[PDB]
Symmetry: D2
Subunit: 232 residues, 4 copies
């Protein structure tokens, strides 16, 4: 399918594939099986902010999820991404549901990347339009009017759908490393609103990186976050 590097906000403990007994945050290289997890304290109904950072000098792809109360989840992964992604990729946001469900409402999304050899990209979405000409949208992802990006299906009465999946990706393919680059570095941030009413909500939100032509790998609702075509 694609080649994927992603940041998982697993709200549901899918443990026969392999997720610890609780909600967590993970680093995925080419698999739904996180190379690294951290316990996360999903705070329902509140707006949280996520930051992801990587430089190719320190080689440690990192992630932070927090809330205004202050609760913070953190994970690291030493890696030369250099070895997993192509010279050209796209950047996007992913979120799914299944049996259990939640809203997946992104209120803003800002990303930056440089190749200090410079070449650099810096886009930042603080409010989303009804028709957003610079976002490829796949799956149940749809925007506007309340100004927000809605990654997963939400009906009229503020009710999240079971078995939904959606993705939004910036229009322009992002050069992310080169042979020329002395420093291949990126950062990316998003402010989300997960709120449900189940036992535990499901399934999560992910920031992702992959090949320019990445679509949804069919049958990736629920526990696969609309990212992988199997749980291998």
């Amino acid at each position: 399918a694609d080649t994927i590097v992603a940041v998982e906000l697993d709200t549901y403990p899918n443990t026969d594939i392999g997720d610890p007994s609780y909600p967590h945050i993970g680093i995925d290289i080419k698999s739904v099986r996180s190379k690294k997890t951290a316990k996360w304290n999903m705070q329902n109904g509140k707006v949280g902010t996520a930051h992801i950072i990587y430089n190719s000098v320190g080689k440690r792809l990192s992630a932070v999820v927090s809330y205004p109360n202050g609760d913070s989840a953190t994970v690291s992964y030493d890696v030369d991404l250099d070895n997993v992604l192509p010279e050209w990729v796209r950047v996007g946001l992913s979120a799914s549901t299944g049996l259990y469900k939640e809203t997946n409402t992104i209120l803003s999304w800002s990303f930056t990347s440089k190749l200090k050899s410079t070449n650099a990209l810096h886009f930042v979405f603080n409010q989303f339009s009804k028709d957003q000409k610079d976002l490829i949208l796949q799956g149940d992802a749809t925007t506007g009017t309340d100004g927000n990006l809605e990654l997963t299906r939400v009906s009229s009465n503020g009710s999240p759908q079971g078995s939904s999946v959606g993705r939004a990706l910036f229009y322009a393919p992002v050069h992310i490393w080169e042979s020329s680059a002395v420093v291949a570095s990126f950062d990316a941030t998003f402010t989300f609103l997960i709120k449900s009413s189940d036992s535990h909500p499901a399934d999560g939100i992910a920031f992702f990186i992959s090949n320019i032509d990445s679509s949804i790998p069919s049958g990736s609702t629920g526990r696969l976050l609309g990212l992988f075509p199997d749980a291998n």
Copy 2:
């Protein structure tokens, strides 16, 4: 063809269509006929820089072209681009030759846009990659090997070609003005080498703004700068 708002570095004095009887810089709205021109003193074989600035509050469209020596040309035009551009555009560069020719070699290209309602796009190319996936090149425009975007066709021994039109469009649509935003604005910078040993070289370089789906009007080589299909 398409809608245009552009900035000409008009080198060849095509006066049976309204150019002044000399090399000039000028602001064109919807026409190869500049609403304001200024005496440019071209400096052949040298590396110059153009800045274009527009802020939607004071509504003044501005342009500067300078050489390292210290010589500068300037041209203003007050206007609510509000009435000439659509909500969504594309941005790029254009150069052309006809009977007399020149090199049209962009060394760097950068652009920023914001909607302080904030939304913002900011790209900067200090080198041009061989297969540069985030550029929509059209006509004889091609990157590569020297590090540079060759807008008009050049032969192997460095000898430029006549009757050659070239264009380079940054990949993404660019929200340029919003109903919603309090301040809509942009800036655009580029470095060039124009070299020839003709009587006057021809025809000149342009930064342009036009509707997302924009293509070179046929027969727009030379004096029309790969921007307009009539001389109206």
Copy 3:
């Protein structure tokens, strides 16, 4: 005294000295007499936002002040600041009160300057202020901190703001504002603010200013002179 170049949010109609008969916004070159005014429609007790844009190529200095409900205000002014201000200045925020009063609560302050000669550039942004802010020269009744806010005019424990107050806040470093090398010498500056009162009118307002590195509140610049000018000249 100093050099001032500022933008006033002139809430009180000081007219025996030449504002007009309403809350306005003005470009002030070296005079509390604004070279250009535009009607502003004060929306008491809401957070508004100002942008102040200047490029050296266009030579037009602009101002916008708006509220959430989208109510706008615009004024511009053609000028070469090349030739008023010197090569080096300080930049800041000023407010005042008098026989009438208001909160002068700045919530965020941001400023960016460039000399496109590969550039010399300065970008700072204040989304929180702190109980100490080692990078903000604080003059007069000014105080950061505690609620998170820069407090330019005296407020008390009871939310009740004090009449006849004056304050200034300035970034700690000088700013190369224009050079003889610079093809473009350009700034922009943004702030968000909360002005609340109850008096017949409130007074007196908020201003963004540029002046010499050594600038300091002129004596008796409380009230209609915004902690900006030693005379009504």
Copy 4:
């Protein structure tokens, strides 16, 4: 003296104090003995760039020193700067000479810091003017006319003096870290020309962080890089 954290471009193999026996770059914490080092092939008279990076999330400090023909050098140190620097600091540059001598010529210097709760500071010198009011100069450091900050004393004929200490500190302080800070991260950049025909040259260039009131320690000339009061 005060408190230091720095990145050393150690050009002289000082070994009765620790330096590995060759030109290197090192991360120094509160001691001239680098807690980390890496071999660097000093390229005489050529212009090189150093990038430094740290994010409080992944807690890894990074340095690259490279010349334009591709040759790099890398060294990394995991550390919680919570612990070593204070809420408030000054950012500055240092170099020195001793028994042996070199040109300590900085051709550009830029730094950025943020507190992503955003509070941010972003400054950059691409040309150093003669009288510069935003720099604190210390020791033998001087600027202007040629366009470059001269960290150690060079006389008229361009002959670099032996036994010279110099420092340049950016005027305003920097909030490096706070308690509210969910992320607090920085990066620096500088371009430099070290030229000499000594035996081995000396002593090297360093980027530093330290407290607002910091100044050159007495007899910190030569092998101490104008940073440390003793060789401990």
